[PDB]
A paper describes a structure:
Structural studies reveal a variety of domain usages (and therefore binding capabilities) at the fibre C-termini, placing these on intertwined trimeric β-prisms. Using independent but complementary approaches, we identified and characterized a MAT superfamily of trimeric fibre proteins with diverse adhesive tips, able to fulfil the long-sought-after role of multiplicity of molecular recognition and handling of diverse epitopes (across a wide prey range), by the bacterial predator B. bacteriovorus.
The resulting structures reveal that both proteins use a related fold. The Bd2734 tip represents a divergent TNF fold, with large pockets between monomers. Bd2734 and Bd2740 are two of the shorter MAT fibres (843 and 627 aa, respectively), which are relevant given that one of the short MATs we were unable to crystallize (Bd2872, 626 aa) was previously identified in a screen for predation-deficient mutants.
Residue numbers in the entry:
A (entry chain A), B (entry chain C): 693 to 843
C (entry chain B): 692 to 843
Amino acid sequence: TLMGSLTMLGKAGCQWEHANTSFASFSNVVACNTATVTGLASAPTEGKIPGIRFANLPAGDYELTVLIFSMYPVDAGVYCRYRLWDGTNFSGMAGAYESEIYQMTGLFSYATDQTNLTFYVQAQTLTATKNCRADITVPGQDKMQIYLKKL
Amino acid sequence: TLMGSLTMLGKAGCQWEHANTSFASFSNVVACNTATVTGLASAPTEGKIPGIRFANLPAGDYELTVLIFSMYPVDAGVYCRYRLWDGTNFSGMAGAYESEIYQMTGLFSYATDQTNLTFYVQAQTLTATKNCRADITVPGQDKMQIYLKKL
Amino acid sequence: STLMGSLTMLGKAGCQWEHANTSFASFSNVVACNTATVTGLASAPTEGKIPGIRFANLPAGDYELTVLIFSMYPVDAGVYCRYRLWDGTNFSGMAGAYESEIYQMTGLFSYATDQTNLTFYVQAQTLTATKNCRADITVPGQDKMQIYLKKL
């Protein structure tokens, strides 16, 4: 069932955020721990970000789960939408407003074998200049686990 | 294993609500898109609602997942309870108060093969006349994905 | 079957667990709670009627642990509580609450070798000393707790 997984332990400085009003992925942050991967999974070519890469994935139905402590809008009074994104399709949209997100789940289907397939956490802020954040800065506490189940 | 799935893409006017103080399913809204189904799944006989039907389902243990952006109480100051319901048992109860639900998960088991088995999202308001809502009115942003896994 | 086992506890007046540990801690036995119902490999935790599930044995592999519970929350306004799933060695599925509730937790756990006497716990931590974090299933016919482990 487990196609692959990716685990990133918290580390000072490992915080992703942007104020894009359109959905956008996060980008590499040098301070992050390298993620440990298993199975068919690898780090995204974009580097240390909330995401997971499958160089090869067979046709089929998949459930993607992101466990992250945690994601939230940085400022009060700001609404942030988050989604899981494979470059083409999205699933598992969620929102945060003076609140946090700790888990996202998405359903994805492929009729043909995939190559170089990356799943991303994306976010959009509903107030320009106000950031949406994914935060694993506290060692020993914060953690991200991403894993893909073949159904 | 993925027993079946049901996907409805968002569309203006496709929102469900009621103000029942007893748990109740939502009812057909004609503006909604026709859902697409895979595997053993079909649309509820009640029509375009948050739910999924299995004309036949083997004995077994099953995890039901509902991904939906989004469900919320229409008015501020109003508490809404939501549950997953198979006609006999409930699972995965959640609440909302000036807040949203994006996902629901339930565990259901059957000792014998089932026929005409429908799973429903149900809701109950804690203030009469004040509605609980499920809302997929924004095309390209909102979507409902319901799927059942055999454990 | 990938369902290694499950544990179910139906709501009952007085079945509420709470503490104010500033460090992550499990809950302890509450006498007013219903006894749990279990399936598969699972058993009730040796600590008693608590948010948790026990696996007297579990083969090496990868597992997803789900807790469905209506509900967990900080007792007081203005207090932040963290919850996490714990197997005595590692944690997963950390969640938080603040004038809000938790209804589901999910964790990913892996074992390179066969496990014996393995218990999974819901643990909590308050960020305001002396202010309780609670798991509440005191309403009969409405509240309940379902815990289950799936082999991946």
